[PDB]
């Protein structure tokens, strides 16, 4: 009886395909031809932060554009100040194989995790002054790829076991669990409404999950390789995803279809990190070609090249106000550009 | 700068000194990776070194030199993702069960995939042909041999450069196949280290130490040559 369900699923997929194709009256390129180009946006290294003993993997800005959290593969969480250049805190991790880090919006807790399959959230405002292990939760049978904070009480964590769950800092238990993708989850990205969040996995699929309802509402399968980066638009209506095919794809939630494909013939390295500015025009994508590229969301033209790294650009992040952009690579140097 | 800016600078200097001490401690120790299929006896190799966690670390000492070996504890079959995090290590030990011929092809494919990696191309690979006694007994019993599994074994001879000639020819053919697979797209930047051992051999630590010393020597030579 498996053939009946197989052909039913195939017919449903074909129906969804022909229903989505009918809504494609015109492309985004045909509409953005009259708008003026963005031009070459030249950027210079404003700040250079050194001190990491290993390769820089994850970084995150807090509520303000001043503090920054970064993780290093030697088991160190560093708190950087972009204005005074002085190190604020240094959290020693029990496991050095960290792959993700997050900063709570309240500015009191910081999460970390990785190959240890244990998510550790530390408190920064401890009355005792020193950093103490606040919540060391476990339960996943896979490596942690990304972690994000929804509020001062809940947290979302991705794992390599294809199953995600919403954890509560008060009790440390899975509040809501999801079905999961087809491959290992690679990255997450929350919406500005804090009610939805879109996740990209190895199956070249991006799924939008809800905090209240534990299920996926839409699915995007426009990519051709493993998706390693994802970032939501500031308005919460679209999101860009970068894959190892040296191509980035902008999927709109309202349109429920791909609108723009950033690609170049000379570019062959895969995308590692994607972030949007405060307006959304400039899309900064880190490539394994030792350079970062800035593209226009409407014109799809190269707006600038950043060659201030000597290794794979592992992470990048734009501040909430768009004053500066931090970039961390495997060269243990953290460059904050204008 | 207020009285607060100077205090922040002093705290930053203290954190930098702590990071320098941690880097010195990290440099004093050496790190190694351990990979292998479930059929291989890597657990016995870990247990014999008496000198839901997805990662397991074993700290031992060879010739007054510390070694921390990291092994996957609980993960899925996927390897393309987490293999990039274990880069920059001193060496990687790939355990293979040379007795069973069925899982031999999968082990060869895994070795070829790991060696030709684009990010791990600067890290050498150590191979330990474990379970030599079982393979010897199986090839001397006459029930199953490498003939029906590989046709090239029918046209391979023992090189000129208490063990029966059959086991010697078999292990030399296996080593030659491994060398031919490793040299493919090697570019000379990293070389493999094949060795023979068993589940009771206690001289494995000396072999690991010699391989790590040779790797460090090659790295120092590459640094001096400014490649």
């Amino acid at each position, epitope marked *: 009886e498996l053939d009946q369900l197989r052909q039913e699923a195939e017919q449903l997929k074909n129906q969804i395909r022909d229903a989505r194709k009918a809504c494609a009256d015109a492309t985004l390129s045909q509409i953005t031809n009259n708008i003026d180009p963005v031009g070459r946006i030249q950027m210079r290294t404003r700040r250079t932060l050194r001190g990491h003993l290993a390769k820089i993997y994850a970084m995150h800005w807090g509520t303000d554009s*001043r*503090l920054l959290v970064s993780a290093s593969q030697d088991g160190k969480l560093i708190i950087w*100040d972009s204005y*005074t250049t*002085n190190k*604020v*805190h240094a959290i020693p991790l029990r496991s050095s194989w960290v792959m993700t880090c997050a900063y709570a919006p309240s*500015g009191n807790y910081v999460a970390c995790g990785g190959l240890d399959n244990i998510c550790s959230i530390y408190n920064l*405002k401890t*009355r*005792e*002054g*020193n950093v103490r292990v606040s919540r060391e939760l476990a339960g996943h049978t896979g490596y942690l790829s990304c972690c994000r904070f929804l509020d001062d009480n809940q947290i979302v964590t991705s794992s390599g076991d294809t199953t995600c769950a919403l954890w509560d800092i008060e009790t440390g238990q899975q509040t809501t669990t999801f079905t999961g993708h087809t491959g290992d989850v690679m990255s997450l990205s929350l919406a500005p409404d804090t009610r939805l969040f879109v996740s990209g996995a190895c199956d070249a699929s991006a799924k939008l999950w809800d905090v209240r309802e534990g299920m996926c509402r839409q699915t995007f399968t426009g990519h051709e390789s493993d998706i390693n980066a994802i970032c939501f638009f500031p308005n919460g209506n679209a999101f860009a995803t970068g894959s190892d095919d040296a191509t980035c794809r902008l999927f709109d939630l309202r349109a429920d279809q791909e609108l723009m494909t950033y690609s170049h013939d000379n570019i062959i390295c895969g995308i590692t990190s994607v972030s949007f500015s405060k307006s959304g025009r400039l899309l900064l994508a880190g490539y394994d070609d030792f350079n970062c590229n800035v593209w226009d969301a409407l014109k799809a033209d190269r707006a600038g090249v950043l060659a201030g790294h000597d290794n794979r650009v592992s992470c990048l992040g734009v501040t909430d106000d768009g004053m500066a952009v931090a970039t961390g690579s495997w060269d243990s140097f953290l460059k904050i550009w204008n | 700068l*207020s*009285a*607060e800016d*100077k*205090a*922040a600078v*002093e*705290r930053s*200097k*203290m954190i930098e000194k702590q990071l320098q001490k941690d880097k010195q401690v990290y440099r004093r120790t050496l790190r190694l990776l351990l990979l292998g299929a479930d059929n291989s006896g890597k657990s016995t190799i870990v247990k014999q070194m008496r000198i839901t966690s997805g990662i397991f670390e074993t700290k031992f000492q060879v010739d007054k030199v510390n070694f921390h070996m990291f092994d996957v504890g609980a993960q899925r079959d996927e390897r393309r993702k987490w293999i990039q995090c274990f880069n920059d290590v001193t060496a990687i030990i790939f355990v293979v069960d040379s007795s069973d011929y069925n899982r031999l092809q999968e082990a060869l494919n895994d070795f070829k995939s790991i060696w030709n990696n684009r990010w791990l191309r600067t890290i050498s690979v150590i191979l330990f042909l474990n379970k030599q006694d079982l393979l010897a007994e199986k090839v001397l019993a006459g029930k199953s041999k490498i003939e029906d599994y590989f046709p090239e074994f029918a046209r391979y001879t023992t090189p000129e450069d208490g063990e029966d000639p059959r086991v010697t020819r078999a292990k030399y053919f296996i080593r030659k196949e491994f060398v031919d697979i490793s040299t493919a797209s090697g570019d000379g930047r990293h070389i493999c280290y094949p060795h023979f051992t068993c589940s009771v051999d206690t001289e494995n630590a000396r072999r690991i130490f010699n391989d790590c010393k040779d790797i460090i020597l090659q790295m120092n030579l590459r640094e001096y040559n400014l490649v």
Partner: single-chain antibody
Amino acid sequence: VQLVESGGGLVQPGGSRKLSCSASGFAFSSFGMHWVRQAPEKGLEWVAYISSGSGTIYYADTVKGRFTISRDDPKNTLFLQMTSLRSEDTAMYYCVRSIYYYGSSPFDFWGQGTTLTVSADIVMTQATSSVPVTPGESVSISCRSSKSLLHSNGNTYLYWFLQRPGQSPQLLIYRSNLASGVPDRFSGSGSGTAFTLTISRLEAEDVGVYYCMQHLEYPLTFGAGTKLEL
């Protein structure tokens, strides 16, 4: 967090005394220490300050050369060796912890202190010293300094300390920015020169003396302190 002081008492003029202070409940090496004196029936006065690892030490211009502060990290202890004690040196000393970073709270916990009886820069001044007010009316304490504390970075170096009879001074505001452990009724406003502390609701445990302090430079200078009677 506990800061237990010892070594005080009666000392003859010209003698010496080492006031010991044991810290517990926190990382002693992470916080910087401050020895601050208080005269009987008078205001506060900063004496000395030491940083982490004894890398930066400062003394008050009135006590330069006589007092010497030191700290031991392995034992988590603090000492203040005094030499050539004068008749005016009779006062109560307090050891305070302070950590400096973005979003910190310097002078958050005040120790019990110990008593010791014998035998040009910025200065904070208060125009009012006593404000009689009912427990059902708001309070507005004004203050003015001789130099604008508004640094180029935009931070306001203003600290308020509420000392109650029998208890230690409690920190209310460290920078407008309300501190931890205090209700939201307290608020701070004003420019770089003039400052205003507003208390919306005055409870039965808010009575005491309010002292103002500036932190633009290392040499500190406390104000006269406004006492509330009820």
